[PDB]
Structures are given as C-alpha cells and as structure tokens.
Amino acid sequence: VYRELGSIVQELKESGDKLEERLTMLSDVNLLSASKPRSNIDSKDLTSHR
Amino acid sequence: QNIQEACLLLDKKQKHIQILIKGNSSSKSQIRRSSVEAQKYVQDKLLPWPQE
C-alpha cells in the first residue's frame, strides 16, 4: 500500500514541478508579444547605433 | 534394566516440557510485540499520505 501511494505522489510531484518550470518560461518578458518597444536603443543594436 | 531406561525417558520428556512452557511464554510475548509494530507502522507511515 505504501509503495503504490509513493508512486502516485512521485508522478504528481514531477508533473507539478515541470508545470512550474514551463509557467516560469512562458512568463519571460522577452517572449511576450505586448512588450512595448524600448524608448532607448539597446547597446546590442549595433545597426541603430551606427 | 527396563525400569532404569524408563526413568531416563521420563527425565528427557520432563526437560522437553520445560522447553515447551518457556517457548510458549516467549511466543505469547512476541504476538503482543507484532500487534504494536503493525499499529505503529500504520500511524507513522500510512496515515500521512492523504495530505501530500
């Protein structure tokens, strides 16, 4: 009984941890379509600087 | 000679009765421990799982 209940909690926990890692990824500001353009030119934007 | 051999048999059987009495007292004590061990396993290991 203990061994089967332990498998179910392990599977639920691994699924929970993978969900939280995906939600943190999908919340990255760089991936969001609604990112207002920066007013300042990025230092990596060599063409706009030139 | 048969009377002497029968006395030695009586003594061997008497030693075995003493071993059996001591063995049954030990077994009664072991059944009581096994009952407490099973209850303690249920309390410490099984009952916590629903909250997780």
Descriptive labels:
2 chains; A: 50 residues; mainly alpha; 2 helices; 58% helix; rod-shaped; B: 52 residues; HAUS augmin-like complex subunit 3 (chain A); HAUS augmin-like complex subunit 5 (chain B)
Overview of the molecule:
- The PDB classes it as cell cycle.
- The entry lists the keywords microtubule, branching microtubule nucleation, spindle assembly, cell cycle.
- Structure of the vertebrate augmin complex.
- This is part of a larger assembly, with chains A (50 residues) and B (52 residues).
- Chain A is mainly α and 50 residues long.
- Chain A is built from two helices and no strands.
- Chain A has helices spanning 2-26, 46-49.
- By secondary structure, chain B is an all-alpha fold.
- The termini of chain B are far apart.
- The A-B interface holds A 1-2, 5, 9 and B 45-46, 49, 52.
What is this structure, in a nutshell?
Chain A has 50 residues and is an all-alpha fold.
Give the biggest sheet of chain A. none
Shape of chain A: rod-shaped
What is the straight-line distance between the termini of chain B?
Answer: 77 Å
The arrangement of helices and strands of chain A along the chain is HH
Secondary structure: helix percent of chain A = 55-70%
Total number of beta strands of chain B: 0
The helix/strand class of chain B is mainly alpha
Structural class of chain A: mainly alpha
What percent of residues of chain B adopt helix (DSSP H or I)? over 70%
Multimerization state: part of a larger assembly
Compute the CA-based radius of gyration of chain B: 23 Å
What does the overall shape of chain B look like? Answer: rod-shaped
Q: Major beta sheet of chain B, specifics?
A: none
Percent range for β-strand residues of chain A: under 5%
| Number of DSSP helical runs of chain A | 2
Subunit structure (chain A): Component of the HAUS augmin-like complex. The complex interacts with the gamma-tubulin ring complex and this interaction is required for spindle assembly.
Protein name (chain A): HAUS augmin-like complex subunit 3
Coiled coil (chain A): 1-30
Function (chain A): Contributes to mitotic spindle assembly, maintenance of centrosome integrity and completion of cytokinesis as part of the HAUS augmin-like complex.
